[PDB]
Every structure is written in structure tokens, then in C-alpha cells.
């Protein structure tokens, strides 16, 4: 596959096969580069390329591992902003990546587990690097990620309404409420727990929500 060549002969073969995208071959170059020379001057950049190319060859855990390798190699680095984005950007793509999106199905009613991991690392990017090549856009990811969390948590908040668990209507919506007031998924959920209060005959407590409904009428 990739034998003991000159390291840049190992590298520039991959550097073309990055652009060629032959990551069946390029990654095996960048591996056998850093298998032999993880002490290469661009072996950090190989690790940057591996965080790149694993996320280009669907090795998103290995991307995370190469992130963790780059965490293990240099957890401070001027491309940790590239990394902590890519830590979220893997976890963004780790969150929801089915072909049902290509077949046109919602995945925000699906598990936002790595959304919250991307909600960490994108926010860890903008906390670690509030200035980066990725700080601005990943912030919109985050606000969208909690909206994805809103459309997720609403998806069961109506379920308790058809379950009829008006206790579990409220606390799920209240779970949305302690997490995001801004999302309309919370704000469409706003009269529902109030209605569920009226199912629990907490009309008066629902009036307190109707007070919100009065003052958040738009």
C-alpha cells in the first residue's frame, strides 16, 4: 500500500489524493506517513488533514479520534478552532446523516444526542476561539441546534397531549421552557400545557400561562 518512502513523497501523494479524494489511498498515505513519521513537521497538518480526510472518508469517529489525537498531540494549536469546529462538525454530521434526508424525511424528531455534542464543541469552538474562521457560522448552528432540540422536545410534548399525560405535557413543555423560550416550538407548546392545566383543572395556573399568552400574543 504505502511503504517507507520519503515522507513528503508519502505526503504529496496524499496531498494530491486529498484533491483527488482517493482517501482509500490518501488516508493510508497520511497514516503510514504518521505511522512512520508522526513527528513530521506537517504531521500535525497530517492530523489536520486526517481530521479533514476522515470526515471526507466517513470516518467521523476516526475524525473524532484524529481530533482526539490532535487533542493528544497539541490540545492548544492555532487549528484547534478548525478542530473544535470539526469536533462539532463531526458531531453535527454525527447527529443526523441518514439518506432519509436525501429521501426527504425529518431528522429533528430524531435523536439530538450528537447535536448536543455539536452544541458543546461549536460552543467550545466559540469559547476557545471567539475570533476564528468558524466562530460566526457555528454560532448559528448552536441556535439552530437548540431549535432542533426544540423541534425534538416538542415532538413528544404533543405526544403527552395525545397520551393525555397532562402532568407530562407540562413538564416536557416546561423542559422546553427552561431551555429555550425563544423557539416557537416552545411557544406553540405554550398554550398546550396551559390547556393541559385546564385538563388538570389548573385553569388558574393556565391563566398564568394565559397571562404569558396575553403578553406573548405575538
Amino acid at each position: 500500500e504505502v511503504p517507507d518512502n520519503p515522507p513528503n513523497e508519502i505526503y504529496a501523494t496524499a496531498q494530491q489524493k486529498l484533491q483527488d479524494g482517493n482517501w482509500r489511498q490518501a488516508i493510508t498515505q497520511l497514516e503510514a506517513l504518521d505511522n512512520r513519521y508522526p513527528f513530521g513537521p506537517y504531521s500535525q497538518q497530517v492530523q489536520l488533514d486526517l481530521i479533514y480526510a476522515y470526515y471526507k472518508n466517513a470516518d467521523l469517529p476516526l475524525a473524532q479520534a484524529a481530533i482526539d489525537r490532535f487533542i493528544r498531540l497539541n490540545p492548544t494549536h492555532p487549528n484547534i478552532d478548525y478542530v473544535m469546529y470539526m469536533r462539532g462538525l463531526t458531531n453535527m454530521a454525527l447527529d443526523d446523516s441518514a439518506l432519509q434526508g436525501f429521501f426527504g424525511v425529518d431528522r429533528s424528531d430524531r435523536d439530538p444526542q450528537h447535536a448536543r455534542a455539536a452544541f458543546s464543541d461549536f460552543s467550545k469552538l466559540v469559547r476557545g476561539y471567539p475570533n476564528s474562521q468558524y466562530t460566526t457560522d457555528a454560532t448559528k448552528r448552536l441556535v439552530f441546534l437548540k431549535d432542533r432540540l426544540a423541534k425534538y422536545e416538542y415532538s413528544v410534548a404533543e405526544y403527552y397531549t395525545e397520551r393525555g399525560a397532562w402532568v407530562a405535557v407540562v413538564n416536557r413543555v416546561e423542559g422546553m421552557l427552561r431551555d429555550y423560550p425563544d423557539t416557537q416550538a416552545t411557544r406553540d407548546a405554550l398554550p398546550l400545557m396551559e390547556n393541559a392545566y385546564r385538563q388538570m383543572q389548573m385553569n388558574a395556573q393556565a391563566e398564568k400561562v394565559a397571562k404569558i399568552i396575553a403578553a406573548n400574543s405575538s
Binding site: T139, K140, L177, D179, T183, A215
Partner: protein
Amino acid sequence: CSSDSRYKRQVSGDEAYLEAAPLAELHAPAGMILPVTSGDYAIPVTNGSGAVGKALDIR
């Protein structure tokens, strides 16, 4: 010729990211003010662009 199944660069399939959450936060009246965002839901809101959205590659 040969088999065709591959994967390459892209960073944001949509800009639903950039089409982030609506802002219908508490304009609720007095006394009706419950807790609103918990943890990093209080998002560290800061900006550094580079290229944003779908525009910037990773290296």
C-alpha cells in the same frame, strides 16, 4: 468501469444552521417569569467569520 461509491468535502448541507431558532422569548408579564435557558443553551454568542455557512473548507 469500476465501482462508484465515494465521499468528499462539504460543510453545511443547508443553511438551516444560518436559519437558526426564532426569537419568541419571554415578553411574559410580571410574576410569570420562569427560567428560560439552561446551561450552554445560554449560548456563548460571539463572532469570528472566516468564511461562514457552506463557504469555508476544512484543512
